[PDB]
Design a protein around this motif. Structure first.
Motif, PDB file in Angstrom:
ATOM      1  N   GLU A 142       0.866  -1.183   0.000  1.00 24.37           N
ATOM      2  CA  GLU A 142       0.000   0.000   0.000  1.00 24.37           C
ATOM      3  C   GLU A 142       0.898   1.227   0.000  1.00 24.37           C
ATOM      4  N   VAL A 143       0.641   2.125  -0.942  1.00 25.20           N
ATOM      5  CA  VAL A 143       1.434   3.335  -1.062  1.00 25.20           C
ATOM      6  C   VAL A 143       1.119   4.241   0.138  1.00 25.20           C
ATOM      7  N   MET A 144       2.169   4.652   0.841  1.00 25.44           N
ATOM      8  CA  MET A 144       2.051   5.470   2.045  1.00 25.44           C
ATOM      9  C   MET A 144       2.208   6.961   1.761  1.00 25.44           C
ATOM     10  N   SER A 145       3.110   7.304   0.844  1.00 24.18           N
ATOM     11  CA  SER A 145       3.334   8.693   0.467  1.00 24.18           C
ATOM     12  C   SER A 145       3.916   8.754  -0.920  1.00 24.18           C
ATOM     13  N   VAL A 146       3.685   9.880  -1.584  1.00 28.63           N
ATOM     14  CA  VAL A 146       4.227  10.120  -2.914  1.00 28.63           C
ATOM     15  C   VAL A 146       4.743  11.549  -3.021  1.00 28.63           C
ATOM     16  N   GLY A 147       5.696  11.742  -3.920  1.00 29.55           N
ATOM     17  CA  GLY A 147       6.215  13.076  -4.220  1.00 29.55           C
ATOM     18  C   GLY A 147       6.964  13.080  -5.540  1.00 29.55           C
ATOM     19  N   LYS A 148       7.030  14.237  -6.191  1.00 26.87           N
ATOM     20  CA  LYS A 148       7.854  14.426  -7.386  1.00 26.87           C
ATOM     21  C   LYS A 148       9.342  14.166  -7.101  1.00 26.87           C
ATOM     22  N   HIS A 149      10.020  13.494  -8.031  1.00 31.22           N
ATOM     23  CA  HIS A 149      11.460  13.296  -7.901  1.00 31.22           C
ATOM     24  C   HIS A 149      12.153  14.680  -7.892  1.00 31.22           C
ATOM     25  N   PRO A 150      13.051  14.926  -6.906  1.00 30.89           N
ATOM     26  CA  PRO A 150      13.702  16.242  -6.702  1.00 30.89           C
ATOM     27  C   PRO A 150      14.457  16.771  -7.924  1.00 30.89           C
ATOM     28  N   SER A 151      14.938  15.865  -8.783  1.00 40.35           N
ATOM     29  CA  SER A 151      15.820  16.238  -9.893  1.00 40.35           C
ATOM     30  C   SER A 151      15.546  15.522 -11.221  1.00 40.35           C
ATOM     31  N   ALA A 152      14.426  14.818 -11.312  1.00 42.42           N
ATOM     32  CA  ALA A 152      14.048  14.153 -12.551  1.00 42.42           C
ATOM     33  C   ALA A 152      12.578  14.373 -12.841  1.00 42.42           C
ATOM     34  N   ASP A 153      12.324  15.025 -13.972  1.00 41.55           N
ATOM     35  CA  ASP A 153      11.038  15.652 -14.272  1.00 41.55           C
ATOM     36  C   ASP A 153       9.859  14.672 -14.329  1.00 41.55           C
ATOM     37  N   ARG A 154      10.101  13.519 -14.939  1.00 36.60           N
ATOM     38  CA  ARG A 154       9.038  12.589 -15.313  1.00 36.60           C
ATOM     39  C   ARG A 154       9.064  11.399 -14.372  1.00 36.60           C
ATOM     40  N   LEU A 155       9.510  11.637 -13.142  1.00 32.28           N
ATOM     41  CA  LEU A 155       9.665  10.552 -12.174  1.00 32.28           C
ATOM     42  C   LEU A 155       8.977  10.876 -10.841  1.00 32.28           C
ATOM     43  N   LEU A 156       8.355   9.860 -10.244  1.00 35.72           N
ATOM     44  CA  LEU A 156       7.624  10.003  -8.977  1.00 35.72           C
ATOM     45  C   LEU A 156       8.280   9.107  -7.921  1.00 35.72           C
ATOM     46  N   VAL A 157       8.493   9.628  -6.706  1.00 31.30           N
ATOM     47  CA  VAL A 157       9.075   8.829  -5.602  1.00 31.30           C
ATOM     48  C   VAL A 157       7.961   8.453  -4.642  1.00 31.30           C
ATOM     49  N   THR A 158       7.941   7.176  -4.248  1.00 30.66           N
ATOM     50  CA  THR A 158       6.895   6.672  -3.390  1.00 30.66           C
ATOM     51  C   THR A 158       7.509   5.859  -2.261  1.00 30.66           C
ATOM     52  N   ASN A 159       6.813   5.835  -1.127  1.00 30.35           N
ATOM     53  CA  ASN A 159       7.129   4.970  -0.001  1.00 30.35           C
ATOM     54  C   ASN A 159       5.972   3.988   0.096  1.00 30.35           C
ATOM     55  N   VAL A 160       6.298   2.699   0.132  1.00 32.07           N
ATOM     56  CA  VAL A 160       5.297   1.644   0.081  1.00 32.07           C
ATOM     57  C   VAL A 160       5.409   0.675   1.273  1.00 32.07           C
ATOM     58  N   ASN A 161       4.293   0.436   1.971  1.00 34.23           N
ATOM     59  CA  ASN A 161       4.231  -0.548   3.062  1.00 34.23           C
ATOM     60  C   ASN A 161       4.063  -1.920   2.404  1.00 34.23           C
ATOM     61  N   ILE A 162       5.064  -2.799   2.527  1.00 37.56           N
ATOM     62  CA  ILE A 162       4.939  -4.179   2.033  1.00 37.56           C
ATOM     63  C   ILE A 162       4.885  -5.218   3.183  1.00 37.56           C
TER      64      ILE A 162
END
Length: 240
Positions: A142-162
């Motif tokens: 389950e995705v816990m949080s998301v945010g835009k990648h700090p330095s890559a335009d077309r990329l998303l960073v996520t934290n996932v509870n596995i």
């Protein structure tokens, strides 16, 4: 006869040991962990894995072999050499500055290797199936949080509870959100310009699967076959 020498589960195991040794080698020699013992134990895994690879025994029957028992023992021994069950927090503590990124990558790679070896038996238990996709663990998150990648335009960073673990996952699907139920393939980590990604979401042309069925940390249910292609490609790329 089963061709164990071509079995992706065993090929991924062998390559993960190589990955571990390289990772540890590039790591700082310190007095608070046993670099030499870690390397020695990993090297000792190689004849076990080679023996399995060249046995030509059915994969279900590889589970209950002295070699499989030995591999798990060596993985536990490495965990002790690294500093015990909480080794992953100790490494990261030597980090602070830019030290964090280098250590996060090291830690991610070690985790990938340990899980490859410790859960190899579960993959072999699946039987006479040779598919790169079953050479790595894929688990409901389950995705816990998301945010835009700090330095890559077309990329998303996520934290996932596995389940027993949280993972950072970088994706090109910018519509992934908190609360999404995803399938995470625990592939070799990739460092996206300082953000260390510990797997890849299952998806196909239309993006990430965001309504994956299953319990957190469990095997995903009802995955469309087209969503397996990228994971297969990634495994093959790892093997070379």
């Amino acid at each position: 006869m089963w061709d164990t020498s071509k079995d992706y589960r065993l090929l991924v195991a062998e390559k993960s040991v190589e990955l571990f040794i390289r990772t540890i080698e590039g790591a700082k020699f310190r007095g608070q962990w046993d670099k030499k013992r870690s390397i020695q134990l990993a090297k000792e895994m190689i004849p076990d894995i080679q023996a399995l690879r060249y046995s030509y025994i059915d994969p279900e029957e590889l589970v209950d072999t002295p070699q499989m028992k030995d591999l798990k023992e060596k993985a536990k021994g490495i965990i002790e050499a690294l500093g015990g069950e909480d080794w992953h927090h100790k490494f990261l503590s030597q980090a602070s500055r830019e030290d964090r990124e280098k250590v996060e990558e090291q830690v991610a790679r070690i985790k990938f290797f340990l899980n490859t070896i410790l859960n190899l038996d579960r993959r072999l238990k699946l039987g006479k199936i040779n598919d790169p996709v079953i050479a790595v663990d894929i688990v409901v998150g389950e995705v816990m949080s998301v945010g835009k990648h700090p330095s890559a335009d077309r990329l998303l960073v996520t934290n996932v509870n596995i389940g027993e673990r949280a993972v950072t996952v970088v994706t090109n699907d910018l519509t992934v959100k908190e609360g999404n139920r995803v399938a995470v393939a625990l592939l070799p980590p990739r460092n996206f310009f300082g953000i260390v990604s510990e797997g890849m979401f299952l998806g196909a042309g239309e993006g990430v699967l965001k309504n994956v069925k299953g319990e957190i940390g469990g095997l995903p249910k009802g995955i469309p076959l087209e969503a397996l292609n990228e994971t297969r490609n990634a495994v093959e790329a790892f093997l070379k």
